[PDB]
Each structure stands twice: as structure tokens, then as C-alpha cells.
Coordinates of C-alpha atoms in Angstrom, one line a residue:
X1 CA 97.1 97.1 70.8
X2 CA 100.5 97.2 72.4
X3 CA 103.0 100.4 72.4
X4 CA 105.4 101.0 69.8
X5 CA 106.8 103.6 68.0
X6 CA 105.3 102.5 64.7
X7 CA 102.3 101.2 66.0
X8 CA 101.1 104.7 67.0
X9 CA 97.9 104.6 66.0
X10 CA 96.3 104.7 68.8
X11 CA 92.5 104.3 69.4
X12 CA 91.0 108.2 69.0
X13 CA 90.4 108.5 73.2
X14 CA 94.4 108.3 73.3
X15 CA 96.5 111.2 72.7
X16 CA 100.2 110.0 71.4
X17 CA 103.0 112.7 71.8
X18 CA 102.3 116.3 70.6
X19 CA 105.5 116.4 68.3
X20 CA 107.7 114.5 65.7
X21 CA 109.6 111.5 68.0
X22 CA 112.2 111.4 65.9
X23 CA 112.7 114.9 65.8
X24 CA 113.9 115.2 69.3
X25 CA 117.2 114.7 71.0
X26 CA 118.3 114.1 74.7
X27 CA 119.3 117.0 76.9
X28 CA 118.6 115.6 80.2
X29 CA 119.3 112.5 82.2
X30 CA 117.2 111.1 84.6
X31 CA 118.5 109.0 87.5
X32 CA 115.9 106.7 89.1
X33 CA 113.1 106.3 86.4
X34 CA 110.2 105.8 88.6
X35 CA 106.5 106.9 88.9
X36 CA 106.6 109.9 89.5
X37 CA 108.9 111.3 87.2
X38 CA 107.0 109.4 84.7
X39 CA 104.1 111.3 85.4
X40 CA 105.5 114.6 86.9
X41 CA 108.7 115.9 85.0
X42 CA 108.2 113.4 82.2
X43 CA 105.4 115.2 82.1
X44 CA 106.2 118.9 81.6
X45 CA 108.7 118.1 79.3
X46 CA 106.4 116.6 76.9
X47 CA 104.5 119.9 76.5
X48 CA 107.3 121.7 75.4
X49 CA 109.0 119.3 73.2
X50 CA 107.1 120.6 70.5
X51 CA 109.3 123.9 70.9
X52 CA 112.3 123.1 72.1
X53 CA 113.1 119.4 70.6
X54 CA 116.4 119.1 72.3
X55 CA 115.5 117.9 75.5
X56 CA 114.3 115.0 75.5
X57 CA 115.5 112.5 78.6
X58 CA 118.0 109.6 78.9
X59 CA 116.9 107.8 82.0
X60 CA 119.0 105.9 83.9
X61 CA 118.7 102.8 86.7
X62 CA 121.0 102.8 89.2
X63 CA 120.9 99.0 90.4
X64 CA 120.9 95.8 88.3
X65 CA 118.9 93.5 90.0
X66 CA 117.3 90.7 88.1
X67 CA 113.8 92.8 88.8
X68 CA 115.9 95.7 87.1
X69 CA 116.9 94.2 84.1
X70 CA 112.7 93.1 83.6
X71 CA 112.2 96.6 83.9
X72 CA 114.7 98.1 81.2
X73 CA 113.8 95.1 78.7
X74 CA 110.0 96.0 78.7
X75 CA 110.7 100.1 78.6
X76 CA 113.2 99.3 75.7
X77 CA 110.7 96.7 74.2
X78 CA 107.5 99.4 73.8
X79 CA 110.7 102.1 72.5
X80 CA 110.4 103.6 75.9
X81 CA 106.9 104.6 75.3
X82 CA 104.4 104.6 78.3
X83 CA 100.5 105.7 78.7
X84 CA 99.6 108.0 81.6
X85 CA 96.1 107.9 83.1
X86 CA 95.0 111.4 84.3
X87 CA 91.8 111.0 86.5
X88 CA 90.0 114.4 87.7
X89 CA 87.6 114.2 91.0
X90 CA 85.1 114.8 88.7
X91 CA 85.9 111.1 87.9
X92 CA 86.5 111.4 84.0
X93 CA 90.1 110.4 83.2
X94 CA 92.5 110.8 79.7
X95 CA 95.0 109.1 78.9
X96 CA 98.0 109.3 76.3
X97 CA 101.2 107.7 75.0
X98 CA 104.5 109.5 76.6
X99 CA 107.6 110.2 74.2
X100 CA 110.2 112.4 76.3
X101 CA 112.1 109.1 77.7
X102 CA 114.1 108.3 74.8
X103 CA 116.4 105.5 76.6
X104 CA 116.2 103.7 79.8
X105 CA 120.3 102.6 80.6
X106 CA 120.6 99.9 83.4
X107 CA 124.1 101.8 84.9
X108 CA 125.5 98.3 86.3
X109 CA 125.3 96.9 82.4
X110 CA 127.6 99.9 81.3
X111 CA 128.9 102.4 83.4
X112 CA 130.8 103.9 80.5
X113 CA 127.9 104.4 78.7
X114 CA 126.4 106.2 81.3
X115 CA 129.5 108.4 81.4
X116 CA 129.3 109.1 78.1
X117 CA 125.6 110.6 78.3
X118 CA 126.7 112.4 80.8
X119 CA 129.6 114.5 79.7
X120 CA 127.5 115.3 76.1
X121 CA 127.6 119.0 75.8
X122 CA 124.2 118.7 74.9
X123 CA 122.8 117.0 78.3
X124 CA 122.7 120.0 80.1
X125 CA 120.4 119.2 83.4
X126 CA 120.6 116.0 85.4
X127 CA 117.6 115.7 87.3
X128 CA 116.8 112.9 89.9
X129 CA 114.1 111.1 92.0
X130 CA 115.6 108.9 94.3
X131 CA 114.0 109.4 97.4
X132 CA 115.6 110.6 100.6
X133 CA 117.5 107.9 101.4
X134 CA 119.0 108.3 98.7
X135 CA 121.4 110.9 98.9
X136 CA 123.1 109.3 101.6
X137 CA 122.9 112.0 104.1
X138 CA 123.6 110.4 107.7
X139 CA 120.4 111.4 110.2
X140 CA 122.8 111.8 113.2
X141 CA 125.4 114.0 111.6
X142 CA 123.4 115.3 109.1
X143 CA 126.6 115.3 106.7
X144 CA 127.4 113.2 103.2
X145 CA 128.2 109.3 104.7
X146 CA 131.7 109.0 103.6
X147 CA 131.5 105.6 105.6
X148 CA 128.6 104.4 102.9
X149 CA 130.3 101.1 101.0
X150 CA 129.6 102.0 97.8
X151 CA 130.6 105.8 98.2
X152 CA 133.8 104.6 99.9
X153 CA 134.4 101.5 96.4
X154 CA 133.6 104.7 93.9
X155 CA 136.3 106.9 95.7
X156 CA 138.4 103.8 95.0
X157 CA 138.1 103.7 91.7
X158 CA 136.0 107.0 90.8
X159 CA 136.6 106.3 86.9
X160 CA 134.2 103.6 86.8
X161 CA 131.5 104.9 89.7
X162 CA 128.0 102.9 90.9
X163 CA 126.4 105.9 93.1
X164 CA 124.6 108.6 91.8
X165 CA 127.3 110.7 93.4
X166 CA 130.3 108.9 91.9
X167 CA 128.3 109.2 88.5
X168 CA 127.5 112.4 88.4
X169 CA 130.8 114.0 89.9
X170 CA 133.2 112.2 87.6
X171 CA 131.0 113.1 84.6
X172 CA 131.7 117.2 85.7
X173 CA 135.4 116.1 86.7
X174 CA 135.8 115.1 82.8
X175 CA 133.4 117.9 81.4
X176 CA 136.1 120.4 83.4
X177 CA 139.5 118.4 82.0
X178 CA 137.9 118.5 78.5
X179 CA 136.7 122.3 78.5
X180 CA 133.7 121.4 78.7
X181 CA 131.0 123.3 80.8
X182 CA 129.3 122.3 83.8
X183 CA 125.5 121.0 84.2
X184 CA 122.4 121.5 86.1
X185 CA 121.7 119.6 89.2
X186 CA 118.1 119.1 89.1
X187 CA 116.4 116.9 92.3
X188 CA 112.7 116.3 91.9
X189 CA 112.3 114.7 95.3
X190 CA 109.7 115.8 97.5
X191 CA 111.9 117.2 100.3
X192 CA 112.3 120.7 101.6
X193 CA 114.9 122.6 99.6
X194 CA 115.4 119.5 98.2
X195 CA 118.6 121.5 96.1
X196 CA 120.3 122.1 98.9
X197 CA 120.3 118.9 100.3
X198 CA 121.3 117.5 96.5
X199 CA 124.6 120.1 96.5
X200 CA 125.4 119.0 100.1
X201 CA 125.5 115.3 98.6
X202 CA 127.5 116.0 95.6
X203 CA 129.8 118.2 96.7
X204 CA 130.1 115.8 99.8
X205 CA 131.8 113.3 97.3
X206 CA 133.4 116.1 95.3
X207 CA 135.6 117.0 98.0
X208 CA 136.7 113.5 99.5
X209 CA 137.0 112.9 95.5
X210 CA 139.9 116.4 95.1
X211 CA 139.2 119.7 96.5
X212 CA 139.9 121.5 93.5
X213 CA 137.4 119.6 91.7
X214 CA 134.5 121.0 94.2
X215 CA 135.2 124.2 94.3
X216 CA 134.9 124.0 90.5
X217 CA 131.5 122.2 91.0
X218 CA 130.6 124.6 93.5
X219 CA 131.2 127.5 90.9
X220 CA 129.7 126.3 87.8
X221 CA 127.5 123.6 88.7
X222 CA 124.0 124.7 89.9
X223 CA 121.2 122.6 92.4
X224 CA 118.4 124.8 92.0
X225 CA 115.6 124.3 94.7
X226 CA 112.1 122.8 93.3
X227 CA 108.5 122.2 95.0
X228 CA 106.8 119.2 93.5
X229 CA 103.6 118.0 93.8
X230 CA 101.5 115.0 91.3
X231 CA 100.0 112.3 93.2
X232 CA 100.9 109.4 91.3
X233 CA 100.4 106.1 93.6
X234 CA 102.0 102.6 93.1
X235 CA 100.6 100.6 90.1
X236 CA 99.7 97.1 91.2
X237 CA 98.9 94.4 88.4
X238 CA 95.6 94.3 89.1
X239 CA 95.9 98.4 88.9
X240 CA 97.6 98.1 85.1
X241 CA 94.7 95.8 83.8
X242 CA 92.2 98.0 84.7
X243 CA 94.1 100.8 83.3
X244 CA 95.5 98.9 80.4
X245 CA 91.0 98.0 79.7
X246 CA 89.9 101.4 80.1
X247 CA 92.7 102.6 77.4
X248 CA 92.4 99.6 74.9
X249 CA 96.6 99.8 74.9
X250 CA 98.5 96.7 75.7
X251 CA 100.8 98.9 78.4
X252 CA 103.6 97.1 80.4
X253 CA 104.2 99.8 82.4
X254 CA 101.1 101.8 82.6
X255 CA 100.8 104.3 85.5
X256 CA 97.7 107.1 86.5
X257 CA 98.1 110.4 88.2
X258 CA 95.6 112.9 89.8
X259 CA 95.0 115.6 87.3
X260 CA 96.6 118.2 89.5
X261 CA 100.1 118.7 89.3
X262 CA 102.2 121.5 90.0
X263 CA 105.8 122.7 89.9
X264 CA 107.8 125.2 91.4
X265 CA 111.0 125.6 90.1
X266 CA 114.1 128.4 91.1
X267 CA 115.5 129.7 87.6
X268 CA 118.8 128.7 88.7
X269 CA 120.4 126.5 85.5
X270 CA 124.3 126.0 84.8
X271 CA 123.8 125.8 81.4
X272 CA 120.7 126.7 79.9
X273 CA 116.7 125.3 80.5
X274 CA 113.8 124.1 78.2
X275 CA 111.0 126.5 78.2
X276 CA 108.8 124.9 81.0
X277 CA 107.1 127.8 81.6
X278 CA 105.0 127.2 78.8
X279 CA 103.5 123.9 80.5
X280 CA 103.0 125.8 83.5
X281 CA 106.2 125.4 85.6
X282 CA 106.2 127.9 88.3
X283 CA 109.9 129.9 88.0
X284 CA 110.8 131.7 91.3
X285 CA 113.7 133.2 92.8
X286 CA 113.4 131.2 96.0
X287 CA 110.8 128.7 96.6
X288 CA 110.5 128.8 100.4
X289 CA 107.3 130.6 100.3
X290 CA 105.7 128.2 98.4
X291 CA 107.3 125.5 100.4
X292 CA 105.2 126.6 103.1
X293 CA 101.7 127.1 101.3
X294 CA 102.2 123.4 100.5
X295 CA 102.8 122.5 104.1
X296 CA 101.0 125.2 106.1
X297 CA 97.4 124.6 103.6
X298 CA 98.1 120.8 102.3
X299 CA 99.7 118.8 104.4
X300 CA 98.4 120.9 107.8
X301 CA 94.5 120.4 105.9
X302 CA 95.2 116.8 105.3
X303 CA 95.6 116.3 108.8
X304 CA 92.9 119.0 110.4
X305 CA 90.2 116.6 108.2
X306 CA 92.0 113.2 109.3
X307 CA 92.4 113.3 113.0
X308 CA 88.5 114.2 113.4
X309 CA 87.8 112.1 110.5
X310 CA 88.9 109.0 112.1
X311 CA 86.8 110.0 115.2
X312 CA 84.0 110.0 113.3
X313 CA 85.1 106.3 111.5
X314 CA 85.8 107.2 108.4
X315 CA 88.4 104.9 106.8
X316 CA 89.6 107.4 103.8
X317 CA 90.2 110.3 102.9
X318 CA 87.3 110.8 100.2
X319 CA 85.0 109.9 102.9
X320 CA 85.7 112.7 105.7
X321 CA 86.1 115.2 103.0
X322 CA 82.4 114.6 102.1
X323 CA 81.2 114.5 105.2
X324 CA 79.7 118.4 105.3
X325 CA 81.2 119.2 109.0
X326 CA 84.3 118.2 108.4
X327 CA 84.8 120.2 105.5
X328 CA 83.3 123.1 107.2
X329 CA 85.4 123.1 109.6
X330 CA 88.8 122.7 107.2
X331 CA 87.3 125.4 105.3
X332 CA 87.0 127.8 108.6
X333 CA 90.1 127.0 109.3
X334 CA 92.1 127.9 105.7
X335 CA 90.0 130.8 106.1
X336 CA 90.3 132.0 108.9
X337 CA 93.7 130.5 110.7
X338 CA 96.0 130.0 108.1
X339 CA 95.2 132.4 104.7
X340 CA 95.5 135.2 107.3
X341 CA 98.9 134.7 108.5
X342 CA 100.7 132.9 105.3
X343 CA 102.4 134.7 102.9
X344 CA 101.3 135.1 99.2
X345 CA 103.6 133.7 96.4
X346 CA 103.1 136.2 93.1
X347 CA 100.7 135.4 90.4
X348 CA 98.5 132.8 92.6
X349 CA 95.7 133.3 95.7
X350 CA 95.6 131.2 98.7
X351 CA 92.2 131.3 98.3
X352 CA 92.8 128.9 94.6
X353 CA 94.8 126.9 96.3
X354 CA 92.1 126.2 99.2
X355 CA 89.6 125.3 96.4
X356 CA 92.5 122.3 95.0
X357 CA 93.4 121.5 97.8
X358 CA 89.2 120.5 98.8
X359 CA 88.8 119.3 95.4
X360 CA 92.1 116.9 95.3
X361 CA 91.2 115.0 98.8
X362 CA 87.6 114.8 97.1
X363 CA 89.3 112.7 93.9
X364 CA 88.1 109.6 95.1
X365 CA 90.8 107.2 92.8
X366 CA 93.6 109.4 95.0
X367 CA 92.1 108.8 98.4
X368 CA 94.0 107.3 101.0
X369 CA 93.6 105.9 104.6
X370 CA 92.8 108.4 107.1
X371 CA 94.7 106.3 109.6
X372 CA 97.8 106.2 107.1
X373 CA 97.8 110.3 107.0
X374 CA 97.9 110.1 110.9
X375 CA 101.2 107.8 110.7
X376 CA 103.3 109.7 112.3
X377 CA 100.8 112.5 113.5
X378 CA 103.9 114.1 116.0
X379 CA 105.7 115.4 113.8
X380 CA 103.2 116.5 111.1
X381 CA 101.6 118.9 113.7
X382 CA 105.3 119.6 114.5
X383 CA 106.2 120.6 111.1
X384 CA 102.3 121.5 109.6
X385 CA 101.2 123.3 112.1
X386 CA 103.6 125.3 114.2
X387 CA 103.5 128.1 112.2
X388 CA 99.8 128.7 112.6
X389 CA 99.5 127.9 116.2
X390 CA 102.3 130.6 116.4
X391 CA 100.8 133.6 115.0
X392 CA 97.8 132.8 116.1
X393 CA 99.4 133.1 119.9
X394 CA 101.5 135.5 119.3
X395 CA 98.9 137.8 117.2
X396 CA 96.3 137.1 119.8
X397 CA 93.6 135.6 117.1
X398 CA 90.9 133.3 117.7
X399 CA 92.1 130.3 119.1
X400 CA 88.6 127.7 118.8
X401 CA 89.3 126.1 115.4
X402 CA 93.0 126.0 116.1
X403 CA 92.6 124.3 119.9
X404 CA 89.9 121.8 117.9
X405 CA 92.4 120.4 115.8
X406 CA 94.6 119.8 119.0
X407 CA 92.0 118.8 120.8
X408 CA 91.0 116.5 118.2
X409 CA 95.0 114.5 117.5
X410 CA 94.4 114.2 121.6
X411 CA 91.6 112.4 121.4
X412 CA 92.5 110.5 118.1
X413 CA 95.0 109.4 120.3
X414 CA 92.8 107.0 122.4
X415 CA 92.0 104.6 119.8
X416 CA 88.2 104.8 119.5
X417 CA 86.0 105.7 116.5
X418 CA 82.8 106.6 117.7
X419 CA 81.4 103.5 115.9
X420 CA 82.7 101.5 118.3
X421 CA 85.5 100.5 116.3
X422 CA 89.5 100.1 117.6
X423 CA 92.2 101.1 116.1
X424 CA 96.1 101.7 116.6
X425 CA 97.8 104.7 115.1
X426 CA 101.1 104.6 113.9
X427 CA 103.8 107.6 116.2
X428 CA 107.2 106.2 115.1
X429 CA 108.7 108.8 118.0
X430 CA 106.8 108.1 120.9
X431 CA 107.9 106.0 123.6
X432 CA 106.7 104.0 126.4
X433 CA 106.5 107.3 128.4
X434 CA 104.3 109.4 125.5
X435 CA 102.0 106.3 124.5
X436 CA 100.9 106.5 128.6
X437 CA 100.1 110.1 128.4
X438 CA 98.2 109.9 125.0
X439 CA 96.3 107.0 126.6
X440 CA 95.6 108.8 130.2
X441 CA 92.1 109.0 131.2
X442 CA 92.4 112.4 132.2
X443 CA 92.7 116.2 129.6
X444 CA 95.5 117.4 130.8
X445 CA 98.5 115.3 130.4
X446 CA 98.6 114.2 126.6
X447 CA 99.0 118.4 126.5
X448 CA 102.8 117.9 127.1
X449 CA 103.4 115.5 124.3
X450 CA 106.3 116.6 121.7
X451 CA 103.9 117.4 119.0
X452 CA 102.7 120.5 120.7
X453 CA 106.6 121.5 121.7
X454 CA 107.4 124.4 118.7
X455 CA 105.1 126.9 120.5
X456 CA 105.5 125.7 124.0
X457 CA 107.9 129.0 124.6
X458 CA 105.1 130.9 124.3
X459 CA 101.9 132.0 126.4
X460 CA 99.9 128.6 125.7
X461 CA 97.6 129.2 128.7
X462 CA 94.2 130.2 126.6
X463 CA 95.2 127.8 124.1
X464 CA 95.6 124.8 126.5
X465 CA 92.5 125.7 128.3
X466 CA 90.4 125.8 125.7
X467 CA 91.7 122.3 124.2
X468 CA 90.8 120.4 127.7
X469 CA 87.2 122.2 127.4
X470 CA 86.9 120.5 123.6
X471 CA 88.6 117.5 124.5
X472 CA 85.7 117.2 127.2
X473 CA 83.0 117.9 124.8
X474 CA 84.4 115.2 122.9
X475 CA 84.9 112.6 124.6
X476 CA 81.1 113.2 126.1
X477 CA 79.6 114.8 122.7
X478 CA 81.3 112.9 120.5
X479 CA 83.8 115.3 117.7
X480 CA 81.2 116.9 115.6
X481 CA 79.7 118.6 118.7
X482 CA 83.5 120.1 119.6
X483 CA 83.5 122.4 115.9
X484 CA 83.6 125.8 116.4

């Protein structure tokens, strides 16, 4: 059956919104309606709509591209109702009907109408997914383009704005003028203190816009830091039929997650919050510690079972997780390496996390390439492992499972599975210069490679010696035989 508000009688293995839809009434606005807000904030909000009705969300599109329009016509057209498919490694999925997203404005159609959402005393958070690029943040300066076209059109006529940033800044410039109160800043873009780079983007514009008007912003206005996780890949059409026949709904724009989700949020709001504690939001003061569990356990495990993993020939994820030295071996090392030496937000244990972070690479409909997790293996080990490699060093800890991992990007490097298949892996920041290293016949010289360069002050003597010994056994052994 397809999606509509009245035709909510949805087959008994869908679930349809836990409160009265017409009950509720918007008090955020979302810019950049996209997957994984539809599945990730969308999300929370749901579960606790039934207590506090007055937040429900006002999305909004910021271009208008024929592609666009599509888009708002079939949201509008099923009342903005969408099913989400939740499928645990366990392989048993649920799925139900979604009713925070109460509008879906095409900005380019109507600016004012946008405008007028906006400075509503009862939208009190503006939250946002629209990827890095997005905020406009030059990668050589590392400052708010001012030289962007459409930044540089909306300071032209800020009154009738296209960015995100001309949007949002005249909708507190009027909220001020009226005596009105400013709103939350809410980014839910997977970036590190992803607050602080959304307050160095708005208040970028805010003070080319009129000084006075950003020190105002930068006194009532909050950008709270958040840590979000929710895999939630792209939906193909061959992805929604199969979705779309397993939940008997006639969904245009059906989407799946991984059961798993998580939110960290700082309890820093200009004007008030809904109760997301009660669906299990995380509130902190600061969320750098958990920052680092994400990176130091995820993203430095994902990798520490890849690089081996494609050694071995495995093609995905789900494969090398299931192979039973591999996961050994990431196991010894969250045990052993990195629990010991990374700090413990409040009411968690590292140890619970370890066990998600195992079972989530195990949820087959998730898994990804191996090779796709190596893209860019440099600066992963730059940022996921540094840390690790540091105290290790510097505490003088066992070095073997740490030097394995090294051992094992080195030798990933080469571009032979020991199937006898070829391969190419993907380092966006090596050159002609690093490619001839990784590629050297020899143990010795890939060790000077930039990914290794955050501990090279230190003492890397024992640490370098033992990765040529592994990288020996190896190449001769094959991977397996190079675990500690």
C-alpha cells in the first residue's frame, strides 16, 4: 500500500509513529534532508514526540534542480512520511513509518518562506547535514570563503539569501530587530567538533554581513559540538524494491540503517531542547573524549582488520571480520593497545563499545569493501592511530600487535593478496616519490612514509625494528603467520 497520512494502516510488521501526527508542531528546521538525518536525527526525535509534541522538523533543500523538485513532490506527495529499515547483524530487520518531518521546502521556490520558518519563536534549533564541503571553509586558509559566488550574491542582497549561511544569519538578524531570541545551531555532520567548525562558518558571514550583528550571534546564538554515528548507506532503486517487498509499503523514498546508532550531544542550546535523552542521546559537557573512542576503537579497528584483511583476499568487511585470526588479533589489540591508554567517557565501558564495534563490521547488509576502508590509508593511520602508537612508545608497552598493524598497511601497500590476486589501493596524498617507497622490494624504506610521521619525534627504534622483522615474516609466511 503506498504512504499517506490517512492511509496509516499499515500491515501489523510496520510500526507507524508512536504519537498523534497532528498533534505535533515544528520546532526545528533541517537544512539538507538527506539519509542520514532521515534515519539518525529524524530518528531520535521520533521517540520523544510523544512527550514533547513541539518539535517536530521543517526540512529544508537548499538547491532547485529539476532532480530537486522530484524530490520535494514525492516527500510532499506521501505527507512527508517515509519507512526506515533497521537491520541488526543478527540479520532480522523492522521497519516503520516516520512522522517528525512535517514539511520538505525547496528554498529556491520561496526564500521567504523559508525566512519565515526561520524567525518562528517556536523553531528553536536549526540543525544541518550538509557535508563538509558544505560550510564553505577554504582547505588552504582554513577560514569562511568570502570569495565563494553565492556567499559573495547573498552579501549583496542578504534579505533574500541562497546559502545556508545567508539563510540562517539573516533569519537571527531579524529575530534580534524584532526582539526576538536567538536559536540553536545544531550540525549533524560527521566532522570533528563539527560545532565549532559550523560557528566559524556562520559567524564568518555574520561579520562580512555587520559586525554588530555577530557579536550578537556570538552571544546568544549557540553551535553545540555533536558525535554522530548510524550507518545508513545510499538507497539504489534496485535497493528500495527490495526494501519496499520486504515491508509490503509502496515507499518512494524508502531508506535502511544498521541498528546501531548513537549520539553524543554537548547540552549547549540557545533556546531550549526536546528531551532526547529519553531516546538515548548521550548529553555531555564536551564531546572530545568520545570523539576519540570513535576514532581511537572504530575507525583505528576498521583499519587494523582491513589492511590484513585484504592480504588475506578478503573483498569486505563482513568477510575479514569472520575470519577467526583476524578478529583475534583486533580483539588483542582493543584489549590490550588501545582500552589501556583511552580515556573513559561516564556511564559507558570501552569494553561495550569493543563488543559493537565487532558486532557492527559483522552486520553483513552494512559491509563494505575492504579496499574502500584502505582509501586513503595515510592519513587514517595518521589520525586513527597516532595516539596509540604514542603511548605505547612513550609508556614503553608491548609493541607486537601495534608494529603488526604497521607492518601490515606496509605490506598492503604492494598490491598482492595472497590469492594471487592484484590490486591498486587508493592514497590520495602520495606522490610519485611515496608510491616508489611503498612499492620497494626492500623493509626498510616504506618506514619513512607520512603515515607513520605523528610519532616519528619519538624513540621509534624498537618499534621500527620489530615491523621490518613482521614485514619479513610476511612477505615469506604470508599475514596470518605475522600475529602476535
Amino acid at each position: 500500500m503506498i504512504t499517506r497520512e490517512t492511509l496509516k494502516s499499515l500491515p501489523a510488521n510496520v510500526q507507524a509513529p508512536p504519537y498523534d501526527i497532528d498533534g505535533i508542531k515544528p520546532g526545528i528546521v533541517h537544512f539538507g534532508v538527506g539519509n542520514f538525518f532521515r534515519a539518525h536525527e529524524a530518528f531520535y526525535v521520533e521517540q520523544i514526540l510523544e512527550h514533547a509534541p513541539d518539535w517536530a522538523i521543517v526540512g529544508v533543500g537548499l538547491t532547485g534542480s529539476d532532480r530537486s523538485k522530484k524530490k520535494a513532490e514525492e516527500f510532499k506527495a506521501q505527507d512527508c512520511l517515509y519507512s526506515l529499515t533497521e537491520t541488526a547483524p543478527s540479520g532480522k530487520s523492522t521497519v516503520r513509518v516516520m512522522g517528525a518531518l512535517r514539511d520538505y521546502l525547496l528554498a529556491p521556490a520561496d526564500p521567504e518562506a523559508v525566512l519565515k520558518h526561520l524567525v518562528d519563536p517556536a523553531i528553536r534549533i536549526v540543525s544541518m547535514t550538509i557535508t563538509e564541503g558544505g560550510y564553505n571553509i577554504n582547505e588552504t586558509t582554513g577560514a569562511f570563503d568570502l570569495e565563494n559566488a553565492a556567499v559573495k550574491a547573498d552579501l549583496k542582497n542578504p534579505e533574500k539569501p541562497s546559502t545556508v549561511f545567508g539563510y540562517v544569519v539573516e533569519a537571527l538578524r531579524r529575530r534580534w530587530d524584532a526582539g526576538g531570541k536567538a536559536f540553536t545551531v545544531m550540525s549533524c555532520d560527521n566532522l570533528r567538533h563539527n560545532g565549532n567548525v559550523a560557528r566559524k562558518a556562520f559567524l564568518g558571514y555574520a561579520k562580512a554581513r555587520d559586525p554588530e550583528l555577530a557579536k550578537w550571534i556570538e552571544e546568544n546564538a549557540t553551535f553545540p559540538n555533536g558525535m554522530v554515528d548510524r550507518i545508513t548507506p545510499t538507497v539504489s532503486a534496485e535497493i528500495a524494491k527490495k526494501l519496499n517487498a520486504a515491508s509490503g509499503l509502496d515507499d518512494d523514498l524508502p531508506l535502511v540503517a544498521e541498528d546501531f546508532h548513537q549520539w553524543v550531544l554537548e547540552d549547549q542550546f540557545a533556546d531550549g531542547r526536546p528531551p532526547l535523552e529519553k531516546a538515548g542521546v548521550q548529553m555531555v559537557g564536551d564531546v572530545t573524549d568520545w570523539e576519540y573512542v570513535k576514532i581511537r576503537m572504530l575507525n583505528a579497528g576498521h583499519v587494523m582488520l582491513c589492511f590484513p584483511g585484504i592480504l588475506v583476499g578478503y573483498e569486505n568487511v563482513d568477510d575479514a571480520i569472520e575470519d577467526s585470526e583476524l578478529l583475534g588479533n583486533l580483539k588483542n589489540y582493543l584489549n590490550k593497545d588501545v582500552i589501556p591508554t583511552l580515556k573513559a567517557p561516564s556511564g559507558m565501558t570501552l569494553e561495550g563499545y569493543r563488543d559493537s564495534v565487532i558486532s557492527r563490521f559483522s552486520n553483513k547488509a552494512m559491509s563494505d569493501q575492504t579496499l574502500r576502508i584502505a582509501s586513503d590509508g595515510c592519513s587514517k593511520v595518521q589520525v586513527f592511530w597516532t595516539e596509540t602508537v604514542r603511548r605505547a612508545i612513550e609508556d614503553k608497552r608491548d609493541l607486537s600487535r601495534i608494529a603488526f598493524g604497521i607492518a601490515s598497511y606496509l605490506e598492503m601497500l604492494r598490491g598482492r593478496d595472497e590469492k594471487g590476486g592484484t590490486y591498486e589501493s587508493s592514497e590520495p596524498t602520495y606522490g610519485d616519490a611515496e608510491w616508489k617507497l611503498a612499492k620497494a622490494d626492500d623493509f626498510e624504506s616504506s618506514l619513512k612514509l607520512p603515515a607513520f610521521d605523528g610519532w616519528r619525534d619519538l624513540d621509534t627504534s624498537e618499534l621500527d625494528q620489530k615491523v621490518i622483522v613482521l614485514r619479513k615474516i610476511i612477505r615469506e609466511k604470508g599475514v596470518k603467520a605475522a600475529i602476535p
